[PDB]
Design a protein around this ligand. Structure first.
Ligand SMILES: CC(C)CN(C[C@@H](O)[C@H](Cc1cccc(F)c1)NC(=O)O[C@H]1[C@H]2CO[C@H]3OC[C@@H]1[C@H]3C2)S(=O)(=O)c1ccc2nc(NC3CC3)sc2c1
Lengths: 99, 99
């Protein structure tokens, strides 16, 4: 679809067999999700944003469905205040900015 | 223009008579700039992101030129790690997401 920005650009995702809402976030390089149970091995990572940093679990090669489009890539799980779909996944679904 | 997301979506802005680069950030409700000298009255505000919060100065009705498009609105100034153009300004320049 086309999404205007009068409201937060929130879409439905499926990841790890679970349904969630997440923000289409062009200011995010990576995809970060609030605590969610994902299978398999992970690596601890510190990531920075406004306010400081958080510790996340990094999962690689995780399939995700983003508003009905299929992608696979790295998902970071940790105490983010919002689920954010970043550019690592947005590039796979052909998401662009236009003005 | 159309902007793809293989790189950070950084554009040139003019604000307060000064030139800066800033991220087109659909995950930002507000526009937040690193320390920059803006004229006039401001109100202290605490804002939250990944990692916690920051104290910012809120300036209202600030004109900004964003990649050659004119907008006016609230700009928050504080210790953000990145200059971000949020939805309060993006809606004025007709910025949309497409996939
Ligand atoms: C700040 C930008 C620069 C980065 N962030 C993406 C922004 O869109 C976040 C999303 C957000 C929204 C809501 C609450 C939040 F806690 C966070 N918006 C945001 O903080 O908004 C703030 C601010 C703007 O106005 C209002 O609107 C929401 C809230 C409030 C005040 S990020 O989440 O820190 C992030 C994400 C992925 C990522 N991947 C990385 N990979 C390594 C380097 C390679 S680093 C990295 C850093």
């Amino acid at each position: 679809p086309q999404i205007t920005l009068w409201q937060r650009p929130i879409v439905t995702i499926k990841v790890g067999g679970q349904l969630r809402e997440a923000l289409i976030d062009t200011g995010a390089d990576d995809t970060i999700l609030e605590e969610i149970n994902l299978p398999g091995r992970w690596k601890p990572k510190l990531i920075g944003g406004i306010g400081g940093f958080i510790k996340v679990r990094q999962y690689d090669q995780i399939p995700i469905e983003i508003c009905g489009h299929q992608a696979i890539g790295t998902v970071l799980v940790g105490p983010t205040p919002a689920n954010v779909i970043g550019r690592n996944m947005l590039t796979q679904i052909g998401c662009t900015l236009n003005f």
